[model samples]
Target chain A: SHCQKTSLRVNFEDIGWDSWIIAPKEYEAYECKGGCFFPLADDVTPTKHAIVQTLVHLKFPTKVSKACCVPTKLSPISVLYKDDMGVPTLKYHYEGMSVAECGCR
Target chain B: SHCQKTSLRVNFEDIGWDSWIIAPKEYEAYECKGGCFFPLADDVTPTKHAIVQTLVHLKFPTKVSKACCVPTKLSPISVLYKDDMGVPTLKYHYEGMSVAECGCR
Candidate 1:
């Protein structure tokens, strides 16, 4: 009905990166889905631009682009992986791969 | 009196990093400033968490933390700098160093 975060699983093997990723076999990378309608709910966390865009679209209907449901926040997951040289490496705070919050934008 | 972006200059020489940063003598890393009061303006993009927090703070006055002005969007700036080996390197999309938007959070 409105922008929200949904559960998602990302498996290294599914992407054929299992050989390189050595730590967790998989991870939960949440996804954002749903509609960004006018009069966004208090929980929708609409950005300023999104709010204005939605209002404009509501009035014009066909002249402007509508807002979208998208990730507003992201959290990082560390990974232990094998490097090109075949050395095991651990990366801390690897970012932009997991969703933490969803919003209208 | 609400959250807004302010101009700021980051000088490498002032920070004693001019030797390492070769190209840009200084850069504008705009800052977020001002207060986050109740009834946030349309221009002050308040996050869902911030909106709720502000409401709570308004009612309880001390039971919750008031929202603060902060960066909402950031743009990357390519930097030409010297590596540890004294080699000049140009790194594109060097991020988290510049502000593009300000908001309440």
Candidate 2:
């Protein structure tokens, strides 16, 4: 690809409420809310908190593959998180060379 | 809860083929083939290149969520990469607070 990157600016205006003012920080990146344990924002209600937390783990790497090298193709792989969901469940399949492979939210 | 990460090892043997080695090189950090474009691999035949590249884009962000902060959740977000397909088609929905938000494929 294009290092200039494909012109596909994600429009977040009406996707939802866009209420998540303080987006969760990347690990150790220091979230503005402070503290550890990926705490939900004080401003965001618990419902919103649970919604964000519960739904956040389902996807990943939809981000720009940094030009650290050439455009690497990230295979569509998945992970099962439930505690008792035991036994590896190889569900989910993605097909594209977009940011999904790089885990860009 | 575990900065230790999961126990999954992602077996590459059964993964059709580790056929993707030179990969895309991530846009430009210089792939092994030595070229501006994402040259598949000198040894890897073209058929394999197209296959790897085509199937690699659907899934996003399924990698290690480095402990850069507390432990943020990446919501299911998606991107579309086409031209005359025109306008926009916001598709793909992920459900989990795992690595999807951060685009960790």
Candidate 3:
């Protein structure tokens, strides 16, 4: 099967950080999940490194590891939190908080 | 031809910014250069979006636009520069200064 993007809802309260996060009580932080078997289809968006790695794994399964389904693109999220001095701070670009794209790598 | 990565040397002095920049007179900031034609081989690392875009472009030559080669991965570079106050400042993790990988998207 090829790698694909799947929905994932991340709740600040779920991880017990709700008190700090003012905005975006919950957000859709997508995730990548799938197998990186040989002969990966075009939809998977396999990287050249992944393709070569997969070939090497197929030839010597014991010697190498298969490609992994990982995040190809990531996006930032705005976060409002309380600082150490008890001040509300708004961070515009809290980077890499969500996955924008997925691919085999 | 599919998208490929190529080397590019960027000299700060050539751009007339060398006076402010100190350390590492030049850097090999690679670039992505190539066309995104249909039937992209496995080596190009075509994305799912790119594949669909290509197929649509092939079906309707002028109706839609084809994918373009772009940097899929980027790396950061540190720079020692003079701040506005003329103080020597060293900034670590200067993001997206160099292209690490290329793909069609």
Candidate 4:
């Protein structure tokens, strides 16, 4: 069995809101009267905080093998988080070399 | 009354393995021939990498109130992680001032 992680990236999507500004810190004051956490600010910036989904693909070190690794069939895996960060951070635990699914809201 | 961080200590329990060395880094060599990830090392020391369960209780700024704080009921709220870190990191998100549950495998 052989599986190697070549690259990885964080995925973001709308969840009753815009794709950006979804990080837990963004929502820290979500319940506050200022409305900072509730909606996306027009001048928002790209930060680590966000309700993100992860996508990772694993494949053989050099060649393909049935026992492990998939060149194309990458899936979401594993687990989350600083309480607030926990909201979007919870999707990472399912990570497996031969996992069937990847990513979450 | 009020609930504050007061202090935070990582909780460890038997999860088919020992309490320490649960961090994702530990599992980096899990699938290797020696089985580093599969079990806790005999000489393992205190480290941050572990499948941890958190317990967080939030309360009002000054004292307990019906609207924001709960001096009695601290809950496990919210979110996961660098794939492997995702396993234990997910629990920190549910850290609401008032909630019902916490902890995970």
Candidate 5:
């Protein structure tokens, strides 16, 4: 029914990081490109949302996204976190292989 | 004076994920162990902190951690995000290689 309604229970509270004492990376980070910082969907998805939350709020944002593997054996992997937020620390690999083979395109 | 106080600059309110929407992974995930979902650490660190933040808070915790590579050529990668959070959707590969070669152990 168009007149039907479902109330929202989304808690806007409890939506942030735990501390400001940010520890540095154990090593150095790189700068990759083409959807670098956010390698997830350009529109929407849980992974996309996660990255958005991290990037928009945290000064240096980091995120993780997991989903079905191609061939139903391997999955997709990608992420980014840095100062520019446009470069890729683009680590989108699964098992021991790049998601490069993920798409033939 | 032995008493030096650093006032807390921490805001606990902006420290949480931004949703209740659970989207299935774009692909099927697996069940891994030995710190499956959380592959970055056994102690404290920023990466470890990120995983904890995602895990304890989000029901399906997906985390992204980065650090130095053993050779100073690459870096460390690890994560977990799912039910039974420990049963990893462990996909800690960087630039397409396992962190397995990372440790000499």
Candidate 6:
């Protein structure tokens, strides 16, 4: 149907350094729906829909349209914890790199 | 206590065009905890902890350390839902720009 997936490296800059990883780049995102120009359209493809349970809702909304999602690859790097003087102290990072989705755009 | 708030514009590139907006930049992120040097540390400040309810637990983890959060600025522009060939079709935007947090990253 519709929904073409793509991988992109969306850059997220921290204080001074950019997190070192893959999921930071390879953004597996896609576009499915456009203007109401369906069936009769060359740009239109059959759209895909799936139903699944979701949260009850709270602060910070999490929602996405059908045939939408983002994916990525990841591995641990290092995170520096700092303060006012800008002195990095503690360090942490993701244990592994994997894929996730915004799925809603 | 600890946790210094900051702002930055994270760039999310899609297709041939990058979405036009502000939240794309100004990432308000901060660091709170460093090495366990704690009270005796100059780089360490009193940590802040708040007890709040969260998801019972499911897919896509969402968690943050004490004094953690991210913020941003955003405004509506245009979003083109597309296909194989680059043709700008439907348009969508946040109508307004505000701050949100990774709060854990």
On TM-score, the candidate that comes out on top is: 1
- Candidate 1 is scored at a TM of 0.48
- Lowest lDDT block of 10, candidate 1 chain A: A44-53
User: What is the TM-score of each predicted model, taking all chains together?
Assistant: 0.48, 0.15, 0.47, 0.14, 0.17, 0.21
> Please, what is the whole-model Cα lDDT of each candidate in the order they appear?
0.66, 0.24, 0.66, 0.22, 0.24, 0.25
Which residues of candidate 2, in runs, are more than 4 Å off?
A: A1-94, A101-105, B1-33, B36-42, B45-105
RMSD (Cα, Å) of model 5: 21.5
Could you tell me how far off, in angstroms, the CA of residue B53 lies in candidate 2 after the best superposition?
11
Better of 1 and 6 by TM-score: 1
Give the alpha carbon lDDT tens digit for every residue of A1-105 in model 4. 112222321221211222322433211100101111222344432111111100011122232111111121223333333344335545453332222321110
Q: Give the alpha carbon lDDT tens digit for every residue of B1-105 in model 6.
A: 322233322223321124432223332212112222122324322211111101111111252112122221223444344544656465555332222222221
The DockQ of each candidate is 0.02, 0.02, 0.02, 0.02, 0.03, 0.02
Specify the highest-DockQ model's number: 5
lDDT of 2 by residue, A1-105 (tens): 211122222212222212331122111111111121233344322222223322322222242111121112323323232234444343344233133212111
lDDT of 2 by residue, B12-65 (tens): 222221233222112111101122123333432222222322222222224211
Off by over 4 Å in 6: A1-105, B1-5, B13-67, B71-77, B94-105
Model 5: TM-score, first chain: 0.17
Candidate 4: where is the Cα deviation over 4 Å?
A: A14-21, A24-65, A70-105, B1-105
Q: Model 3 over residues A6-27: C-alpha lDDT tens digits? A: 7756666654566778777887
Q: Per-candidate TM-score, first chain only?
A: 0.83, 0.17, 0.81, 0.19, 0.17, 0.27
The clash number for model 5 is: 18
What C-alpha RMSD does candidate 6 show over the true interface residues after superposing them? Answer: 17.3
Query: Sorted by TM-score, highest first, which candidate order results?
Result: 1, 3, 6, 5, 2, 4
- How far out, in Å, is residue B25 in model 2? 29
Per model, kept true contacts as a fraction are: 0.00, 0.00, 0.00, 0.00, 0.00, 0.00
State which docking tier applies to candidate 6: incorrect
